Write a protein that binds this DNA or RNA. Structure first.
Ligand code: NA
Ligand code: NA
Ligand code: NA
Ligand code: NA
Lengths: 166, 166
DNA sequence: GTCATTGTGGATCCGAG
DNA sequence: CGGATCCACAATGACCT
Protein backbone atom coordinates (compact mmCIF):
# COMPACT_ATOMS: atom_id res chain seq x y z
CA UNK A 1 0.00 0.00 0.00
CA UNK A 2 1.27 3.43 -0.99
CA UNK A 3 -0.18 6.55 0.57
CA UNK A 4 -0.35 9.48 -1.83
CA UNK A 5 -0.13 12.84 -0.04
CA UNK A 6 -0.79 16.40 -1.15
CA UNK A 7 -0.56 19.70 0.71
CA UNK A 8 -1.72 23.18 -0.27
CA UNK A 9 0.18 25.95 1.50
CA UNK A 10 0.45 29.67 2.23
CA UNK A 11 3.35 29.79 -0.21
CA UNK A 12 6.58 28.08 -1.07
CA UNK A 13 8.10 28.41 2.39
CA UNK A 14 5.13 26.55 3.91
CA UNK A 15 2.17 27.10 6.20
CA UNK A 16 -0.52 24.50 5.61
CA UNK A 17 -4.08 25.28 4.53
CA UNK A 18 -5.07 21.84 3.26
CA UNK A 19 -3.81 18.27 3.35
CA UNK A 20 -5.19 15.10 1.79
CA UNK A 21 -4.30 11.52 0.84
CA UNK A 22 -5.42 8.42 -1.00
CA UNK A 23 -4.07 4.88 -0.83
CA UNK A 24 -3.06 2.82 -3.83
CA UNK A 25 -3.63 -0.89 -3.18
CA UNK A 26 -3.52 -3.46 -6.00
CA UNK A 27 -3.82 -0.80 -8.68
CA UNK A 28 -6.91 0.73 -7.08
CA UNK A 29 -7.45 4.06 -5.30
CA UNK A 30 -9.14 3.86 -1.91
CA UNK A 31 -9.41 5.42 1.56
CA UNK A 32 -9.69 9.15 0.68
CA UNK A 33 -8.95 11.66 3.44
CA UNK A 34 -8.74 15.48 3.47
CA UNK A 35 -8.60 18.27 5.97
CA UNK A 36 -8.63 22.00 5.66
CA UNK A 37 -6.05 23.35 8.04
CA UNK A 38 -5.43 26.57 9.94
CA UNK A 39 -2.01 27.79 8.83
CA UNK A 40 0.80 29.08 11.06
CA UNK A 41 1.00 32.23 8.92
CA UNK A 42 -0.97 34.41 6.49
CA UNK A 43 -1.92 32.99 3.09
CA UNK A 44 -0.06 34.81 0.30
CA UNK A 45 -2.08 36.17 -2.63
CA UNK A 46 0.11 34.20 -5.02
CA UNK A 47 -0.76 30.95 -3.18
CA UNK A 48 -4.40 31.98 -2.79
CA UNK A 49 -4.60 32.49 -6.58
CA UNK A 50 -3.54 28.90 -7.10
CA UNK A 51 -5.52 26.91 -4.48
CA UNK A 52 -8.31 29.45 -3.92
CA UNK A 53 -8.51 28.75 -0.24
CA UNK A 54 -9.32 31.96 1.57
CA UNK A 55 -8.52 32.92 5.17
CA UNK A 56 -12.17 32.62 6.12
CA UNK A 57 -12.29 29.05 4.78
CA UNK A 58 -9.61 28.01 7.30
CA UNK A 59 -10.07 30.45 10.23
CA UNK A 60 -11.64 27.93 12.64
CA UNK A 61 -9.85 24.79 11.44
CA UNK A 62 -7.47 22.53 13.34
CA UNK A 63 -3.69 23.22 13.33
CA UNK A 64 -1.51 20.89 11.24
CA UNK A 65 -0.25 19.19 14.44
CA UNK A 66 -3.85 18.30 15.34
CA UNK A 67 -4.55 16.73 11.97
CA UNK A 68 -1.29 15.11 10.87
CA UNK A 69 -1.62 11.98 13.06
CA UNK A 70 -4.58 10.81 10.93
CA UNK A 71 -2.15 10.38 8.05
CA UNK A 72 0.20 8.08 10.02
CA UNK A 73 0.13 4.35 9.31
CA UNK A 74 1.95 3.82 5.99
CA UNK A 75 5.41 2.53 5.06
CA UNK A 76 5.37 4.62 1.86
CA UNK A 77 4.38 8.23 1.30
CA UNK A 78 4.14 9.35 -2.31
CA UNK A 79 4.07 12.96 -3.52
CA UNK A 80 4.70 14.85 -6.72
CA UNK A 81 7.99 16.57 -5.92
CA UNK A 82 8.07 14.93 -2.48
CA UNK A 83 10.99 17.21 -1.56
CA UNK A 84 8.38 19.92 -1.11
CA UNK A 85 5.77 18.10 1.05
CA UNK A 86 8.46 16.45 3.19
CA UNK A 87 9.85 19.91 4.00
CA UNK A 88 6.58 21.71 4.73
CA UNK A 89 4.91 18.88 6.67
CA UNK A 90 5.82 17.59 10.16
CA UNK A 91 8.06 14.51 10.10
CA UNK A 92 6.27 11.47 8.62
CA UNK A 93 6.81 7.84 9.81
CA UNK A 94 7.50 6.29 6.40
CA UNK A 95 9.73 6.51 3.34
CA UNK A 96 9.12 9.01 0.53
CA UNK A 97 8.53 8.31 -3.13
CA UNK A 98 8.62 11.14 -5.66
CA UNK A 99 6.51 10.74 -8.81
CA UNK A 100 8.37 13.65 -10.36
CA UNK A 101 11.72 11.94 -10.13
CA UNK A 102 10.03 8.76 -11.31
CA UNK A 103 8.44 10.42 -14.36
CA UNK A 104 11.70 12.07 -15.40
CA UNK A 105 13.57 8.76 -15.11
CA UNK A 106 10.87 6.76 -16.93
CA UNK A 107 10.32 9.21 -19.82
CA UNK A 108 13.54 11.23 -20.35
CA UNK A 109 12.88 14.84 -21.36
CA UNK A 110 9.17 14.69 -20.50
CA UNK A 111 7.46 17.75 -19.03
CA UNK A 112 7.11 16.97 -15.37
CA UNK A 113 4.64 19.16 -13.54
CA UNK A 114 1.74 17.19 -12.04
CA UNK A 115 -0.94 18.33 -14.52
CA UNK A 116 1.36 18.33 -17.55
CA UNK A 117 2.13 14.66 -16.86
CA UNK A 118 -1.56 13.85 -16.35
CA UNK A 119 -2.38 15.59 -19.65
CA UNK A 120 0.40 13.98 -21.71
CA UNK A 121 -0.05 10.51 -20.25
CA UNK A 122 -3.73 10.81 -21.19
CA UNK A 123 -4.79 9.58 -17.77
CA UNK A 124 -8.41 9.38 -16.69
CA UNK A 125 -9.17 9.22 -12.99
CA UNK A 126 -12.57 9.70 -11.37
CA UNK A 127 -12.01 12.78 -9.24
CA UNK A 128 -14.14 13.59 -6.21
CA UNK A 129 -17.02 16.05 -6.62
CA UNK A 130 -16.98 19.68 -5.51
CA UNK A 131 -13.25 20.28 -5.99
CA UNK A 132 -10.78 21.56 -8.56
CA UNK A 133 -7.14 21.36 -9.58
CA UNK A 134 -4.97 22.54 -6.68
CA UNK A 135 -7.34 21.34 -4.01
CA UNK A 136 -5.44 18.71 -2.10
CA UNK A 137 -7.77 15.71 -2.52
CA UNK A 138 -8.24 16.49 -6.20
CA UNK A 139 -4.49 16.52 -6.82
CA UNK A 140 -4.10 13.29 -4.82
CA UNK A 141 -6.29 11.55 -7.39
CA UNK A 142 -4.17 12.98 -10.20
CA UNK A 143 -0.92 11.89 -8.59
CA UNK A 144 -2.31 8.47 -7.68
CA UNK A 145 -3.43 7.97 -11.29
CA UNK A 146 0.05 9.02 -12.36
CA UNK A 147 1.68 6.59 -9.91
CA UNK A 148 -0.46 3.68 -11.11
CA UNK A 149 0.54 4.50 -14.69
CA UNK A 150 4.21 4.67 -13.67
CA UNK A 151 3.99 1.21 -11.99
CA UNK A 152 2.22 -0.52 -14.89
CA UNK A 153 4.61 1.06 -17.40
CA UNK A 154 7.79 0.24 -15.48
CA UNK A 155 7.06 -2.73 -13.26
CA UNK A 156 8.87 -0.88 -10.45
CA UNK A 157 8.17 -1.93 -6.86
CA UNK A 158 7.78 0.38 -3.91
CA UNK A 159 11.43 -0.40 -3.04
CA UNK A 160 12.84 0.36 -6.49
CA UNK A 161 10.86 3.58 -6.59
CA UNK A 162 12.16 4.68 -3.18
CA UNK A 163 15.69 3.92 -4.39
CA UNK A 164 15.26 5.99 -7.56
CA UNK A 165 13.77 8.75 -5.34
CA UNK A 166 17.06 8.69 -3.41
CA UNK B 1 51.17 -2.24 -49.99
CA UNK B 2 51.77 -0.90 -46.50
CA UNK B 3 55.12 -1.04 -44.76
CA UNK B 4 55.16 -1.62 -41.00
CA UNK B 5 58.17 0.01 -39.32
CA UNK B 6 59.50 -0.54 -35.78
CA UNK B 7 62.56 1.04 -34.13
CA UNK B 8 64.40 0.10 -30.94
CA UNK B 9 66.27 2.98 -29.33
CA UNK B 10 68.59 4.19 -26.61
CA UNK B 11 65.56 5.59 -24.83
CA UNK B 12 62.58 7.86 -25.29
CA UNK B 13 64.63 10.70 -26.77
CA UNK B 14 65.92 8.62 -29.67
CA UNK B 15 69.24 7.08 -30.61
CA UNK B 16 68.64 4.11 -32.90
CA UNK B 17 69.84 0.60 -32.04
CA UNK B 18 67.60 -1.41 -34.39
CA UNK B 19 65.16 -0.85 -37.22
CA UNK B 20 62.91 -3.37 -38.96
CA UNK B 21 60.05 -3.61 -41.43
CA UNK B 22 57.49 -5.96 -42.93
CA UNK B 23 55.10 -5.33 -45.78
CA UNK B 24 51.45 -6.18 -45.80
CA UNK B 25 50.15 -7.09 -49.24
CA UNK B 26 46.66 -8.53 -49.78
CA UNK B 27 46.38 -9.32 -46.07
CA UNK B 28 49.69 -11.23 -46.21
CA UNK B 29 52.95 -10.35 -44.41
CA UNK B 30 56.00 -10.46 -46.69
CA UNK B 31 59.51 -9.01 -47.16
CA UNK B 32 60.89 -8.95 -43.58
CA UNK B 33 63.93 -6.68 -43.13
CA UNK B 34 65.96 -5.56 -40.12
CA UNK B 35 69.24 -3.81 -39.27
CA UNK B 36 71.12 -3.38 -36.03
CA UNK B 37 72.24 0.23 -35.86
CA UNK B 38 75.06 2.14 -34.18
CA UNK B 39 73.31 4.79 -32.08
CA UNK B 40 74.44 8.40 -31.63
CA UNK B 41 74.34 8.15 -27.80
CA UNK B 42 74.65 5.69 -24.88
CA UNK B 43 71.96 3.01 -24.54
CA UNK B 44 70.00 3.70 -21.31
CA UNK B 45 69.77 0.76 -18.85
CA UNK B 46 66.00 1.23 -18.98
CA UNK B 47 65.94 0.74 -22.75
CA UNK B 48 68.36 -2.16 -22.64
CA UNK B 49 66.10 -3.98 -20.18
CA UNK B 50 63.32 -3.73 -22.76
CA UNK B 51 65.06 -4.59 -26.06
CA UNK B 52 68.15 -6.37 -24.67
CA UNK B 53 70.48 -4.92 -27.33
CA UNK B 54 73.96 -4.20 -25.89
CA UNK B 55 76.70 -1.71 -26.74
CA UNK B 56 78.87 -4.56 -28.04
CA UNK B 57 76.10 -5.74 -30.39
CA UNK B 58 75.93 -2.34 -32.10
CA UNK B 59 79.51 -1.04 -31.85
CA UNK B 60 80.53 -1.97 -35.41
CA UNK B 61 77.15 -1.43 -37.10
CA UNK B 62 76.28 1.30 -39.60
CA UNK B 63 74.68 4.63 -38.56
CA UNK B 64 70.94 5.07 -39.18
CA UNK B 65 71.52 7.27 -42.28
CA UNK B 66 73.61 4.48 -43.84
CA UNK B 67 70.84 1.98 -43.44
CA UNK B 68 67.57 3.90 -43.78
CA UNK B 69 67.42 4.01 -47.62
CA UNK B 70 66.76 0.24 -47.54
CA UNK B 71 63.32 1.10 -46.16
CA UNK B 72 62.47 3.49 -49.01
CA UNK B 73 59.99 2.26 -51.60
CA UNK B 74 56.63 2.35 -49.85
CA UNK B 75 53.85 4.97 -50.02
CA UNK B 76 52.64 4.10 -46.53
CA UNK B 77 54.58 3.73 -43.30
CA UNK B 78 52.72 2.07 -40.44
CA UNK B 79 53.85 2.13 -36.81
CA UNK B 80 52.28 1.67 -33.42
CA UNK B 81 52.51 5.13 -31.98
CA UNK B 82 53.88 6.40 -35.30
CA UNK B 83 54.62 9.78 -33.67
CA UNK B 84 57.46 8.10 -31.81
CA UNK B 85 59.07 6.43 -34.82
CA UNK B 86 58.60 9.52 -36.96
CA UNK B 87 60.32 11.69 -34.33
CA UNK B 88 63.36 9.44 -33.82
CA UNK B 89 63.96 8.37 -37.46
CA UNK B 90 65.26 10.45 -40.36
CA UNK B 91 62.62 11.66 -42.81
CA UNK B 92 60.72 8.94 -44.70
CA UNK B 93 59.33 9.26 -48.25
CA UNK B 94 55.69 8.36 -47.57
CA UNK B 95 52.65 8.92 -45.38
CA UNK B 96 52.45 7.74 -41.80
CA UNK B 97 49.75 5.61 -40.25
CA UNK B 98 49.40 5.03 -36.53
CA UNK B 99 47.83 1.70 -35.49
CA UNK B 100 47.51 3.08 -31.96
CA UNK B 101 45.34 6.04 -32.99
CA UNK B 102 43.40 3.67 -35.22
CA UNK B 103 42.80 1.17 -32.42
CA UNK B 104 41.73 3.87 -29.94
CA UNK B 105 39.30 5.26 -32.53
CA UNK B 106 37.98 1.72 -33.17
CA UNK B 107 38.01 0.34 -29.62
CA UNK B 108 37.90 3.16 -27.06
CA UNK B 109 38.91 2.53 -23.43
CA UNK B 110 40.70 -0.68 -24.42
CA UNK B 111 44.36 -0.94 -23.26
CA UNK B 112 46.23 0.12 -26.39
CA UNK B 113 49.85 -1.04 -26.32
CA UNK B 114 51.01 -3.14 -29.25
CA UNK B 115 50.84 -6.47 -27.42
CA UNK B 116 47.65 -5.73 -25.43
CA UNK B 117 45.75 -5.14 -28.67
CA UNK B 118 47.26 -8.26 -30.22
CA UNK B 119 46.07 -10.25 -27.21
CA UNK B 120 42.63 -8.64 -26.85
CA UNK B 121 41.93 -9.12 -30.56
CA UNK B 122 42.96 -12.77 -30.32
CA UNK B 123 45.38 -12.47 -33.23
CA UNK B 124 47.81 -15.14 -34.40
CA UNK B 125 50.58 -14.74 -36.94
CA UNK B 126 53.74 -16.67 -37.65
CA UNK B 127 56.42 -14.79 -35.74
CA UNK B 128 60.17 -14.92 -36.39
CA UNK B 129 62.24 -17.25 -34.14
CA UNK B 130 65.65 -16.13 -32.80
CA UNK B 131 64.00 -12.95 -31.49
CA UNK B 132 61.65 -11.89 -28.70
CA UNK B 133 59.08 -9.17 -27.99
CA UNK B 134 60.85 -5.77 -28.20
CA UNK B 135 63.17 -6.76 -30.96
CA UNK B 136 62.27 -4.64 -33.97
CA UNK B 137 61.40 -7.34 -36.51
CA UNK B 138 59.35 -9.30 -34.00
CA UNK B 139 57.21 -6.31 -33.08
CA UNK B 140 56.71 -5.62 -36.82
CA UNK B 141 54.86 -8.92 -37.20
CA UNK B 142 52.73 -8.08 -34.18
CA UNK B 143 51.86 -4.65 -35.59
CA UNK B 144 51.25 -5.96 -39.10
CA UNK B 145 48.77 -8.44 -37.65
CA UNK B 146 47.01 -5.60 -35.83
CA UNK B 147 46.92 -3.47 -38.98
CA UNK B 148 45.36 -6.31 -41.04
CA UNK B 149 42.76 -6.77 -38.30
CA UNK B 150 42.06 -3.04 -38.14
CA UNK B 151 41.58 -3.07 -41.95
CA UNK B 152 39.08 -5.96 -41.99
CA UNK B 153 37.08 -4.66 -39.04
CA UNK B 154 36.97 -1.09 -40.23
CA UNK B 155 37.09 -1.37 -44.00
CA UNK B 156 39.25 1.79 -43.96
CA UNK B 157 41.51 2.50 -46.92
CA UNK B 158 45.15 3.50 -46.64
CA UNK B 159 44.24 7.13 -47.45
CA UNK B 160 41.54 7.16 -44.74
CA UNK B 161 43.92 5.63 -42.22
CA UNK B 162 46.49 8.34 -43.03
CA UNK B 163 43.77 11.03 -42.64
CA UNK B 164 42.80 9.77 -39.17
CA UNK B 165 46.50 9.71 -38.23
CA UNK B 166 46.97 13.42 -39.08
C1' DG C 1 51.93 15.41 -27.82
C1' DT C 2 47.37 12.90 -28.64
C1' DC C 3 43.34 11.26 -26.86
C1' DA C 4 39.70 8.59 -23.91
C1' DT C 5 38.49 9.31 -19.57
C1' DT C 6 37.56 11.82 -15.22
C1' DG C 7 36.28 15.80 -12.71
C1' DT C 8 34.53 20.64 -11.75
C1' DG C 9 32.85 25.46 -11.49
C1' DG C 10 29.20 27.87 -13.63
C1' DA C 11 25.16 29.03 -16.00
C1' DT C 12 20.52 27.80 -16.52
C1' DC C 13 16.00 25.92 -15.95
C1' DC C 14 12.65 23.36 -13.14
C1' DG C 15 9.32 21.53 -9.84
C1' DA C 16 6.54 22.67 -5.43
C1' DG C 17 2.28 26.93 -3.14
C1' DC D 1 15.31 26.41 -2.36
C1' DG D 2 17.00 21.82 -3.74
C1' DG D 3 18.15 19.43 -8.12
C1' DA D 4 18.97 18.18 -12.83
C1' DT D 5 21.72 19.08 -16.91
C1' DC D 6 24.95 20.73 -20.04
C1' DC D 7 29.16 23.04 -20.86
C1' DA D 8 33.73 24.70 -21.10
C1' DC D 9 37.69 23.38 -19.27
C1' DA D 10 41.46 21.20 -17.07
C1' DA D 11 43.86 17.30 -15.21
C1' DT D 12 45.09 12.24 -15.48
C1' DG D 13 47.42 8.68 -17.61
C1' DA D 14 49.04 5.34 -21.05
C1' DC D 15 51.51 5.06 -25.24
C1' DC D 16 56.51 4.98 -27.67
C1' DT D 17 62.32 3.07 -25.75
NA1 NA E 1 1.74 19.20 -4.32
NA1 NA F 1 -1.52 20.43 -5.27
NA1 NA G 1 57.69 0.74 -31.39
NA1 NA H 1 59.14 -2.50 -30.36
Amino acid sequence: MLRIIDTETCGLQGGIVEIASVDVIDGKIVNPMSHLVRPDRPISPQAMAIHRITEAMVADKPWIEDVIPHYYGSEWYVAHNASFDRRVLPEMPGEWICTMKLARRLWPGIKYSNMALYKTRKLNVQTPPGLHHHRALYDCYITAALLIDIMNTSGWTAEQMADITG
